[PDB]
A = this chain, B = another copy of it.
Amino acid sequence: YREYTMLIRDEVVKMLEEPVKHDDHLLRDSELAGLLSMSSASNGESRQLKFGRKTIFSTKKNMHVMDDMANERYTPGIIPPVNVDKPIPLGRRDVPGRRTRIIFILPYEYFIAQHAVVEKMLIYAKHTREYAEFYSQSNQLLSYGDVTRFLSNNTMVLYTDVSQWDSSQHNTQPFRKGIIMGLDILANMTNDAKVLQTLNLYKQTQINLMDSYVQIPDGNVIKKIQYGAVASGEKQTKAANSIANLALIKTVLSRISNKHSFATKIIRVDGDDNYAVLQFNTEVTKQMIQDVSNDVRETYARMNAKVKALVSTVGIEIAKRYIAGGKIFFRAGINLLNNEKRGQSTQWDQAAILYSNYIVNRLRGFETDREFILTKIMQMTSVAITGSLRLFPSERVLTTNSTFKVFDSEDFIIEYGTTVDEVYIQRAFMSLSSQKSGIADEIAASSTFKNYVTRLSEQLLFSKNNIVSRGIALTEKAKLNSYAPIS
């Protein structure tokens, strides 16, 4: 894993080489940025809180910062240990046709110590084609065209399914070693306390992780076993995962070269799949593909990693898209009548979501009869005013472009008030669009909210910032509803 981890570290450095020496303001003030980002942060345990003179069960990580700051408990410089003493709760992600995967549940100190670095990492990715997921504003079509591009009778394509490898206990040591090693190299590049502070804190996240215990339930009881594998839940997850996956293919591809001579035309990563089109100084024979595939699989095997290493000359399949016959294909299996998890959406939104799902499927392939969908919307939107009187909303109410719009009167086509009635109703609907919450206001009434906002601003403003200040408050008052008692 010397070759493998070495690339992971090096990739980390490039992504953060120029910013570190210059002493990027983002790196220096990483704490404020991560703090601000919380709205787009993961999730933590549904802790207990008190604001003013009441109690709540908020699970949102941002609010935790509020309770902690207004309680002298807030201490980001000290990132909670994720081991036997204070293990990691657990979250999950289900998907049809695949073993269930777990999701960590690290506290907020972790997101804060990871937002700036990852964000800076992504910018590098943003302009690097190897990362087919980030590059520019690129859509899946660009990725599709790139593969067919070099396909010729003298070049074979190779795709993989490193999903299991990303959680292989073997992977964690290298993965963590490389990230930490790079942070070390970057730290010996600056003399800025703010940056070094950030460079160091990120390093610690990896060290605490190196040995992480999991609060795994086992019935109405909560067991507590160890865990030497890497899971998702960190900011760097999606970004760092790619770095590793890209690092892996580079390692396998170079090793196989020892035997056959090719030419790496393109190399790419995409979550749980990494591919590459390599050209050969001669025509591709069945024997050649069989040999390379074997050499590739054995190589993957040597690194003790479970993977689906296939090889072709005209097509590739991966989790997001499959190119069969030179044509681009997308899977179309989004369960419509069985959701993955019970979120916080409402029955109405549930329907608008169902219609959204239906359209995506129709576009991709699978097509549930539209009459059936209309029926569901009829069932899902209706509301009862009495025990023997339901009120089924009309098509105009349902499709008119508003905050309650569920679908379209003609799939793929969006209409806009053209008649007087549509506009008459259109202006009328906006009225009762945002109705205050007898909780979302009082919360901004406690010293906690005021201190948190002011505390964040005091290190963000100089003059009379209120245009900025007014927005930050609503930024929270827009997510706060999440909390059951408010939603």
Q: A356-B480, A429-B427, A449-B354 are in contact. Are A438 and B347 (CB under 8 A)?
A: yes
Does A281 sit within 8 A of B, measured CB to CB? no
Known A31-B364, A420-B474; further 19 A-B contacts with Cβ < 8 A: A37-B362, A38-B363, A58-B336, A63-B336, A66-B366, A74-B366, A333-B451, A334-B446, A343-B445, A345-B444, A350-B444, A351-B439, A353-B445, A363-B456, A376-B483, A381-B440, A382-B439, A394-B441, A396-B441
Interface centre among A324, A443, A485 (most CB of B within 10 A): A443
Q: Which residues on the B side are within 8 Å of A53 (C-beta)?
A: 338-339, 342
**Which among A177-185, A194-202, A254-262 touches the partner chain?**
A194-202
The contact of A421 among B28, B77, B405, by CB within 8 Å, is B405
Smallest CB separation, A408 vs chain B (Å): 3
Q: Which residues on the B side are within 8 Å of A476 (C-beta)?
A: 352, 354-360, 407-408, 411
Q: A59-B371, A403-B417 are in contact. Are A353 and B483 (CB under 8 A)?
A: no
| Docked-complex contact A395 and B41, CB < 8 angstroms | no
**Assembly stoichiometry (copies):** 4
Q: Which residues on the B side are within 8 Å of A44 (C-beta)?
A: 367-371
**Which among A2-10, A91-99, A244-252 touches the partner chain?**
A91-99
Q: A327-B29, A439-B379, A443-B357 are in contact. Are A370 and B415 (CB under 8 A)?
A: no
| Docked-complex contact A436 and B477, CB < 8 angstroms | no
- Residues of A159-192 at the interface with B, using a CB-CB cut-off of 8 Å, are 192
Q: Which residues on the B side are within 8 Å of A369 (C-beta)?
A: 43-47, 58-61, 63-64
| Docked-complex contact B462 and A370, CB < 8 angstroms | no
Does A282 sit within 8 A of B, measured CB to CB? no
Does A211 sit within 8 A of B, measured CB to CB? no
- Residues of A426-459 at the interface with B, using a CB-CB cut-off of 8 Å, are 426-459
| Docked-complex contact A425 and B436, CB < 8 angstroms | yes
| Docked-complex contact B357 and A34, CB < 8 angstroms | no
Does A326 sit within 8 A of B, measured CB to CB? yes
Across the A-B interface, the 10 shortest Cβ-Cβ residue pairs? A380-B439, A379-B485, A402-B424, A353-B444, A350-B442, A354-B443, A59-B371, A349-B441, A39-B411, A431-B431
Smallest CB separation, A452 vs chain B (Å): 3
25 A-B residue pairs with Cβ-Cβ distance under 8 Å, sorted by A, are A38-B411, A46-B371, A58-B358, A62-B358, A66-B333, A71-B335, A74-B364, A337-B446, A340-B447, A349-B444, A352-B443, A353-B445, A355-B478, A356-B449, A357-B451, A363-B456, A376-B483, A376-B484, A376-B486, A398-B478, A401-B421, A402-B424, A411-B479, A424-B425, A429-B435
| Docked-complex contact A444 and B357, CB < 8 angstroms | yes
Q: A60-B411, A193-B314 are in contact. Are A366 and B485 (CB under 8 A)?
A: no
Does A75 sit within 8 A of B, measured CB to CB? yes
The contact of A349 among B326, B392, B440, B475, by CB within 8 Å, is B440
Smallest CB separation, A275 vs chain B (Å): 15
Interface centre among A329, A381, A440 (most CB of B within 10 A): A440
Does A150 sit within 8 A of B, measured CB to CB? no
Does A143 sit within 8 A of B, measured CB to CB? yes
**Which among A14-22, A134-142, A216-224 touches the partner chain?**
A134-142
| Docked-complex contact B480 and A352, CB < 8 angstroms | yes
| Docked-complex contact B346 and A442, CB < 8 angstroms | yes
Smallest CB separation, A38 vs chain B (Å): 2
